[PDB]
Design an enzyme around this catalytic site. Structure first.
Site, PDB file in Angstrom:
ATOM      1  N   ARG A  90      24.934 -67.435 -80.900  1.00 41.57           N
ATOM      2  CA  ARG A  90      23.853 -68.418 -80.829  1.00 41.57           C
ATOM      3  C   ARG A  90      24.370 -69.834 -81.052  1.00 41.57           C
ATOM      4  O   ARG A  90      25.236 -70.060 -81.893  1.00 41.57           O
ATOM      5  CB  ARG A  90      22.764 -68.127 -81.870  1.00 41.57           C
ATOM      6  N   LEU A  92      23.824 -73.290 -82.763  1.00 49.48           N
ATOM      7  CA  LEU A  92      23.145 -73.692 -83.989  1.00 49.48           C
ATOM      8  C   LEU A  92      22.587 -75.107 -83.901  1.00 49.48           C
ATOM      9  O   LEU A  92      23.181 -75.986 -83.276  1.00 49.48           O
ATOM     10  CB  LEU A  92      24.101 -73.586 -85.176  1.00 49.48           C
ATOM     11  N   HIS A 108      36.958 -68.896 -81.044  1.00 46.27           N
ATOM     12  CA  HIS A 108      36.672 -69.034 -79.624  1.00 46.27           C
ATOM     13  C   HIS A 108      37.861 -68.530 -78.817  1.00 46.27           C
ATOM     14  O   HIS A 108      38.996 -68.894 -79.112  1.00 46.27           O
ATOM     15  CB  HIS A 108      36.368 -70.486 -79.285  1.00 46.27           C
ATOM     16  N   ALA A 140      30.960 -78.259 -85.025  1.00 43.49           N
ATOM     17  CA  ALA A 140      30.263 -79.537 -84.923  1.00 43.49           C
ATOM     18  C   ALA A 140      29.038 -79.321 -84.034  1.00 43.49           C
ATOM     19  O   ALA A 140      28.886 -78.250 -83.456  1.00 43.49           O
ATOM     20  CB  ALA A 140      31.184 -80.606 -84.358  1.00 43.49           C
ATOM     21  N   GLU A 173      43.243 -63.337 -82.214  1.00 39.87           N
ATOM     22  CA  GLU A 173      42.054 -63.754 -82.990  1.00 39.87           C
ATOM     23  C   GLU A 173      42.110 -63.170 -84.388  1.00 39.87           C
ATOM     24  O   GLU A 173      41.796 -63.842 -85.367  1.00 39.87           O
ATOM     25  CB  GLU A 173      40.754 -63.302 -82.320  1.00 39.87           C
TER      26      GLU A 173
HETATM   27  N1  LIG Z   1      26.102 -76.456 -82.524  1.00 40.07           N
HETATM   28  C1  LIG Z   1      27.085 -75.434 -82.350  1.00 40.07           C
HETATM   29  N2  LIG Z   1      26.717 -74.154 -82.356  1.00 40.07           N
HETATM   30  C2  LIG Z   1      27.624 -73.180 -82.189  1.00 40.07           C
HETATM   31  N3  LIG Z   1      27.485 -71.863 -82.160  1.00 40.07           N
HETATM   32  C3  LIG Z   1      28.669 -71.275 -81.973  1.00 40.07           C
HETATM   33  C4  LIG Z   1      28.891 -69.809 -81.887  1.00 40.07           C
HETATM   34  C5  LIG Z   1      29.475 -69.494 -80.552  1.00 40.07           C
HETATM   35  C6  LIG Z   1      28.401 -69.578 -79.529  1.00 40.07           C
HETATM   36  C7  LIG Z   1      28.967 -69.216 -78.196  1.00 40.07           C
HETATM   37  C8  LIG Z   1      28.037 -69.771 -77.177  1.00 40.07           C
HETATM   38  C9  LIG Z   1      26.749 -69.386 -76.994  1.00 40.07           C
HETATM   39  C10 LIG Z   1      26.083 -70.084 -75.964  1.00 40.07           C
HETATM   40  C11 LIG Z   1      24.707 -69.803 -75.647  1.00 40.07           C
HETATM   41  O1  LIG Z   1      24.198 -70.303 -74.654  1.00 40.07           O
HETATM   42  N4  LIG Z   1      23.948 -68.961 -76.528  1.00 40.07           N
HETATM   43  C12 LIG Z   1      22.649 -68.649 -76.327  1.00 40.07           C
HETATM   44  C13 LIG Z   1      22.406 -67.337 -76.800  1.00 40.07           C
HETATM   45  C14 LIG Z   1      22.550 -66.336 -75.706  1.00 40.07           C
HETATM   46  C15 LIG Z   1      22.769 -64.988 -76.308  1.00 40.07           C
HETATM   47  O2  LIG Z   1      21.954 -64.536 -77.160  1.00 40.07           O
HETATM   48  O3  LIG Z   1      23.773 -64.304 -75.967  1.00 40.07           O
HETATM   49  C16 LIG Z   1      21.812 -69.535 -77.046  1.00 40.07           C
HETATM   50  O4  LIG Z   1      22.078 -69.867 -78.237  1.00 40.07           O
HETATM   51  O5  LIG Z   1      20.778 -69.995 -76.495  1.00 40.07           O
HETATM   52  C17 LIG Z   1      26.812 -71.037 -75.315  1.00 40.07           C
HETATM   53  S1  LIG Z   1      28.350 -71.017 -76.059  1.00 40.07           S
HETATM   54  C18 LIG Z   1      29.649 -72.261 -81.882  1.00 40.07           C
HETATM   55  C19 LIG Z   1      28.977 -73.491 -82.024  1.00 40.07           C
HETATM   56  C20 LIG Z   1      29.342 -74.834 -82.022  1.00 40.07           C
HETATM   57  O6  LIG Z   1      30.504 -75.189 -81.876  1.00 40.07           O
HETATM   58  N5  LIG Z   1      28.378 -75.770 -82.196  1.00 40.07           N
HETATM   59  N1  LIG Z   2      32.105 -68.410 -77.743  1.00 41.37           N
HETATM   60  C1  LIG Z   2      32.265 -67.380 -78.746  1.00 41.37           C
HETATM   61  C2  LIG Z   2      32.981 -66.165 -78.209  1.00 41.37           C
HETATM   62  O1  LIG Z   2      33.197 -66.003 -77.008  1.00 41.37           O
HETATM   63  N2  LIG Z   2      33.343 -65.296 -79.145  1.00 41.37           N
HETATM   64  C3  LIG Z   2      34.158 -64.147 -78.840  1.00 41.37           C
HETATM   65  O2  LIG Z   2      33.410 -62.932 -78.878  1.00 41.37           O
HETATM   66  C4  LIG Z   2      34.277 -61.859 -79.281  1.00 41.37           C
HETATM   67  C5  LIG Z   2      33.624 -61.088 -80.415  1.00 41.37           C
HETATM   68  O3  LIG Z   2      34.360 -59.913 -80.741  1.00 41.37           O
HETATM   69  P1  LIG Z   2      34.102 -59.121 -82.121  1.00 41.37           P
HETATM   70  O4  LIG Z   2      32.600 -58.864 -82.204  1.00 41.37           O
HETATM   71  O5  LIG Z   2      34.914 -57.851 -81.951  1.00 41.37           O
HETATM   72  O6  LIG Z   2      34.573 -60.102 -83.155  1.00 41.37           O
HETATM   73  C6  LIG Z   2      35.579 -62.498 -79.747  1.00 41.37           C
HETATM   74  O7  LIG Z   2      36.549 -62.421 -78.700  1.00 41.37           O
HETATM   75  C7  LIG Z   2      35.208 -63.949 -79.920  1.00 41.37           C
HETATM   76  O8  LIG Z   2      36.299 -64.833 -79.706  1.00 41.37           O
END
Ligand SMILES: Nc1nc2[nH]c(CCCCc3cc(C(=O)N[C@@H](CCC(=O)O)C(=O)O)cs3)cc2c(=O)[nH]1
Ligand SMILES: NCC(=O)N[C@@H]1O[C@H](COP(=O)([O-])[O-])[C@@H](O)[C@H]1O
Length: 200
Positions: A90, A92, A108, A140, A173
């Site tokens: 999600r 944040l 990531h 951030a 990772e």
């Molecule tokens: N402010 C902020 N929030 C963060 N969350 C995460 C954590 C990594 C997030 C990876 C990513 C998820 C999505 C996304 O579109 N998520 C959806 C949810 C969809 C789903 O449920 O699968 C959403 O939130 O609307 C795009 S990248 C990293 C990070 C960050 O650096 N900054």
């Molecule tokens: N943008 C975030 C993202 O792509 N996260 C990725 O989801 C996987 C979770 O695996 P896990 O549930 O086995 O930790 C991991 O590869 C992590 O880097």
């Protein structure tokens, strides 16, 4: 330092953090695991390790702010110092991110700033890189743009798929996430007042 790990799925990164934080010299303890999704394998891993779990279904809240507020309540309940996003998928909210500025880490599966977003492996494969990797960074408001703590390069092999590439990258990772958590929890690394990484 007291740590919360937030997950959305399998929890292999969570398991690596559990293993590392239980070593005698660990400066971090995991006190709570929070999932936005029910019945995921990461919750089994946490329970098996005797760590408390909470499911905060984002599907039950009016907006992102209310959802994050629910998370934050649990964080306060367990007197958390540091938050790790470990396969938590999600975005944040601003206020939540600002509150935990310098105290929240994310893993990531690319070498940032390349391939930001939720499908890094697909992007890396489409682009045709022969080197990818993973990144632990401070969170951030701008997604995947926060200060970089550690990275590790991982080769792309010809014929790789998301399945084979993600498998190889997850091995890295599981190395750098525990290392990064230990750096922050020990106070060795902090987010600087100038917003750049500070190695104390
Ligand atoms: N402010 C902020 N929030 C963060 N969350 C995460 C954590 C990594 C997030 C990876 C990513 C998820 C999505 C996304 O579109 N998520 C959806 C949810 C969809 C789903 O449920 O699968 C959403 O939130 O609307 C795009 S990248 C990293 C990070 C960050 O650096 N900054
Ligand atoms: N943008 C975030 C993202 O792509 N996260 C990725 O989801 C996987 C979770 O695996 P896990 O549930 O086995 O930790 C991991 O590869 C992590 O880097």
């Amino acid at each position: 330092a007291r740590v919360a790990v937030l997950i959305s799925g399998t929890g292999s990164n969570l398991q690596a953090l559990i293993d590392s934080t239980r070593e005698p010299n660990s400066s971090a303890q995991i006190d709570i695991v929070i999932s936005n999704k029910a019945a995921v394998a990461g919750l089994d891993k946490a329970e098996r390790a005797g760590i408390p779990t909470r499911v905060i279904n984002h599907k039950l809240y009016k907006n992102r702010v209310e959802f994050d507020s629910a998370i934050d309540l649990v964080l306060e309940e367990f007197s958390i110092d540091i938050v790790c996003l470990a396969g938590f998928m999600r975005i944040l909210s601003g206020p939540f991110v600002q509150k935990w500025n310098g105290k929240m880490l994310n893993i990531h599966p690319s070498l940032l700033p390349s391939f930001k977003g939720s499908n890094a492996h697909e992007q890396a494969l489409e682009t045709g890189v022969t080197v990818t990797g993973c990144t632990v960074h401070f969170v951030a408001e701008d997604v995947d743009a926060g200060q970089i703590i550690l990275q590790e390069a991982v080769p792309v092999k010809r014929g790789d798929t998301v399945a084979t590439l993600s498998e190889r990258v997850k091995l890295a990772e599981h190395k750098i996430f525990p290392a990064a958590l230990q750096l922050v929890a020990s106070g060795t690394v902090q987010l600087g007042e100038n917003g750049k990484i500070c190695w104390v």
